[PDB]
Amino acid sequence: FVTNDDIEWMLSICVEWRLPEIAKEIYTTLGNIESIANFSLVKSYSWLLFEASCMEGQKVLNAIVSKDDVIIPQDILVTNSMRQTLAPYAVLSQFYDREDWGQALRLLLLLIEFHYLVLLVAKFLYPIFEDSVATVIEVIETKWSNLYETIIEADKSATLLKNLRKKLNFKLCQAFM
């Protein structure tokens, strides 16, 4: 096979004969940034998810589709994908006070579901600097290596202490309210 059609023919024969293990293998061969996007076994999906999260923390058409174009939407019509879509929505909300709070809440929820991500979240909270918010902050503190430290250093351009300080500040703010 070389063309797309060739592959589709193969697949059509795997369907026609019921060879899911074969199709799964062929496809595996095909999978081996744009290529990865096209692909989006369990471990690989997890890795893709992690990468997407890292990209979001760092922060186009594909992202919008996840959240010519109509055809793509039809084709799309998984957990990794949903998470990336959520991250994108959060970033959009951020770009756009209550909205910001909703985004922060979404971020905390994502962190709970999932170290680097947690650090990015803490960084975002510090930058921003009621009961639900406090509860979230608390859960995060309860949840709380080299790559994480590097990310922290890049952000600054000790971490646990800064986090604790931020939490204390938030608590004080809640008390004042």
Partner: peptide
């Protein structure tokens, strides 16, 4: 739908 999948 996208916000129901994020909450899950």
């Amino acid at each position: 739908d996208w916000v129901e999948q994020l909450i899950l």
